[PDB]
Nucleic acid binder design. Sequence first.
DNA 1: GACCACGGCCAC
DNA 2: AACAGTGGCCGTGGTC
Length: 540
Amino acid sequence: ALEEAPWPPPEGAFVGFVLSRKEPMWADLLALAAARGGRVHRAPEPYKALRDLKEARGLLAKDLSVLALREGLGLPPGDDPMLLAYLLDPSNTTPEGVARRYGGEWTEEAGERAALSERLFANLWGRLEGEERLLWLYREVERPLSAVLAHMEATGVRLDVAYLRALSLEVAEEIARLEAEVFRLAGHPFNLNSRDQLERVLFDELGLPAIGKTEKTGKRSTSAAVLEALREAHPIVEKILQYRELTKLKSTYIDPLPDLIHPRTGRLHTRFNQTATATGRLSSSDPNLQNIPVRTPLGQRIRRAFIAEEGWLLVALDYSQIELRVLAHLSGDENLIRVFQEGRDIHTETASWMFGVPREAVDPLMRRAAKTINFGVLYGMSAHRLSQELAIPYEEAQAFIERYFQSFPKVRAWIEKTLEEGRRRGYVETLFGRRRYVPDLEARVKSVREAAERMAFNMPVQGTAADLMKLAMVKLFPRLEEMGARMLLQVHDELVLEAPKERAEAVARLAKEVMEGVYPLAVPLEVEVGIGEDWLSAKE
DNA sequence: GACCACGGCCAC
DNA sequence: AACAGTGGCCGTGGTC
Ligand SMILES: O=c1[nH]c(=O)n([C@H]2C[C@H](O)[C@@H](COP(=O)(O)OP(=O)(O)OP(=O)(O)O)O2)cc1-c1cc2ccccc2o1
Ligand SMILES: [Mg+2]
Ligand SMILES: [Mg+2]
Ligand SMILES: [Mg+2]
């Protein structure tokens, strides 16, 4: 940890390493070091020294394991003090912040990162002695999960590049037509992408009324909620919303994604961040593949670009009404449990209410609208906003929210119990004991307290569902290798797999069973599954 | 070139 | 916009 011994290190040492850049699939490995006892080992040539390691044990283990897979080396991740910190407090999200909480410094030298990994592991493992529930989540979920994510990251997903490039041009021509239509209505040209320029045109030059203001700077907002509020008080607004949709999808997905294909795989490689969220969810970045478009007809065209290798099929599995089922288990609502022990669909039921139509005539776009509504209401939405999203008088929306919860009395009782317990203990917890600390529950400004309250009772629900999915991933991944299949993506309550066409149907059937039986609840988990040549087909 | 705050908006 | 929650990436506008 200050003293130096010749490479290689002894078995079980802690590793540090420096990458030329944050993405492991794209990084040059600039330095590799390892630490054990009172000694640090430094490698003369980093790529060769990788061959010597049996596992990756230390800070950001998964990242080094991914780079090793890229080179054809099986170097699974083992212990990672970031995972210990994240289980102790999920505000622990980066090495910089962990080190300056638990007794070190994160620099840019591999040998220091290795010596830091050594101490940070000893400190945090000691803080976890006696937290049997957190130790369980570390050994049975997070640590084995890191290996699953490393393989997902190194495998990647195939993308139809020539398609997206052709699509970029069709979208550009439609963007330019819309720009010209707005310029004409404004009587002049300007930067439609400049929020501040648009504000002035809409609210000063034209007379349009300003419905709301931005948070930090108090400017007149031009957000969709504001604009759609007057989608007919001027047609220009209508075109602006269509321009925004198109430019958003072009600059975020259509244009950048094609330029991210890796030269040695032919595929697109995301990163699955395991200590990035306050609830236990994963996140995805560089690029985010958890927010690929899907809701609009153009977003659908984009999602179709995600395709199976030649000779394989994509398999898509998605839990049914997942947080609603979890809520049933957590709250013990007899009436809510029943709903699911009878195969009812509350998303479909709210849509039938919303659109005045029998359950037989709800289509997939209707039910999507009802999902946002049902979860909006659930987690604390206000009567006022609902009346505005649903386009109905204030008093009509007040009432749905009343009936929504009368249905299931035990829910509000579980909310209040969770908060009281969170006020007493400092934190709220998932079914498996994952914690989120929420101090503001006893803040003296109502607005701050009530926000903390909404964050606080959402966490056990969203975080239990994430625990279940993570555990499902951990159980499923060994069965996929034995069938010659691959795990490609996770989108919170959804998995995408890639399987040989000859094994696709068996793989689907199997993955569904594992997901549904991951951890029986007081309510059955149902999983929808589809198979197709592309990401969209598989979700149908 | 690198970093940042902000408004805004995609997904779950 | 807002008494829904959880993320990450865009362009703009700005500094060093
Ligand atoms: O606005 C939201 N707020 C929120 O907190 N979530 C959470 C809660 C859900 O259980 C979980 C998984 O989401 P999801 O798989 O899409 O939905 P569900 O599992 O409940 O239902 P199903 O699979 O169709 O049967 O994500 C989702 C949405 C939402 C709204 C929407 C509209 C379109 C497409 C997806 C959507 O997602
Ligand atoms: Mg679902
Ligand atoms: Mg889903
Ligand atoms: Mg730069």
